[PDB]
Design a binder for this molecule. Sequence first.
Ligand code: DTP
Ligand code: CA
Ligand code: MG
Length: 430
Amino acid sequence: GPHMATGQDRVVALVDMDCFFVQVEQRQNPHLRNKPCAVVQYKSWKGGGIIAVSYEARAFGVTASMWADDAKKLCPDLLLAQVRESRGKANLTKYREASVEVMEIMSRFAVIERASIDEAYVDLTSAVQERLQKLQGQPISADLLPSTYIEGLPQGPTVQKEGMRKQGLFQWLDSLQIDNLTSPDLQLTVGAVIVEEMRAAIERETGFQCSAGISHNKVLAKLACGLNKPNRQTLVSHGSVPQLFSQMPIRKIRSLGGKLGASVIEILGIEYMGELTQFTESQLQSHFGEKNGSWLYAMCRGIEHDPVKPRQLPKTIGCSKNFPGKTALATREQVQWWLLQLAQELEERLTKDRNDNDRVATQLVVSIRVQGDKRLSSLRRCCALTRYDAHKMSHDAFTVIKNCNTSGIQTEWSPPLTMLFLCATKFSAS
DNA sequence: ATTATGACGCT
DNA sequence: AGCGTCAT
Ligand SMILES: Nc1ncnc2c1ncn2[C@H]1C[C@H](O)[C@@H](COP(=O)(O)OP(=O)(O)OP(=O)(O)O)O1
Ligand SMILES: [Ca+2]
Ligand SMILES: [Mg+2]
């Protein structure tokens, strides 16, 4: 009853860029705007692999993780922009730099957690308290929420999508108690007003559109964001959770899309998030462990406590390349040349990071895959990173992996390497 | 031959 | 520490 926490203490948003690498390429090349188009890396094998797709192209069934030659079968007029290649490998610098543009704008409004190259969480609790005072019990006009959906509405006693959006928004606003400055629903609404402003700023200052979710925690904000993509934002209230979750496949919730989520389904014999409410906390802990069990017990009631971490910069800087099929590295000379290529890109990015962000990496992680293994990594080894020097780093990497060579002859490499990976970690202020 | 990343959990 | 899981 009165002592039952409802997880309505925070206002959290998740902002996610729409079709992000495609928008980056469309800004640069106006010929790609408002077209079925995709971003591809490499080209020789099956036309290259698609890693981002415009919404126009998605209408034809084009997806990421598709080969371009196959995409062209669905969409013959598909336009393609290629990822830059430097030192023999795909280079994602353009997209990392575009990411920084958006992250710096978001940071003006609140402290953010960089969740990926194109999305960030925002804790708006304090900003909302501030704006609520400015408002002075003034109602919130629908005009302040021009791209907002209220999940679950309209309900009860309609043909167009925009028309439906406004119907739901009006029902929501009509029901709002603006008198209470601690009403969670009001707090979410003001949060949504701020996120409209944030999203307008991002589009004005970069040209990029995005979607967003507004709720009381990160998991609901993420879920909300996807409900109305692209170029829209969605408010998921605490009250909307029972209906929303009653038909929500468990795999849709962040962290449940893999083996754990499959185990929840199998062990408990359920399909939807809402069905979890029928188990005790101890029951869930017994199957999924203490931490997961407690997290699931709260999450299926719309409650989660994971903080938005104040972290705008990535914690690691890494460089990776696959050498598939026939291209696997089978000579020592090959291995050394590619370690150098990776190390040179790594040095470049590290030197820029040190200048921009006043920090230095202190640990180098070296990872490889050997032909045969189905795991991402076959072997991961760390060594000290004491100088930002590519030749030193590549020599050090070679030293820590050279023992994996089963070949009796040492100019040859067996089994051949199908992946190299260099990663800089353990930053210290500088 | 679904590539190039990046965070966090386990033991 | 090195490995695994999950994610974009
Ligand atoms: N598996 C991947 N491999 C390589 N790059 C990826 C992968 N997934 C995502 N990316 C890149 C390309 C995407 O444009 C960018 C952001 O990913 P993501 O948010 O999942 O999709 P998106 O921004 O392209 O479309 P959406 O509008 O659905 O968000 O990160
Ligand atoms: Ca996105
Ligand atoms: Mg994203």
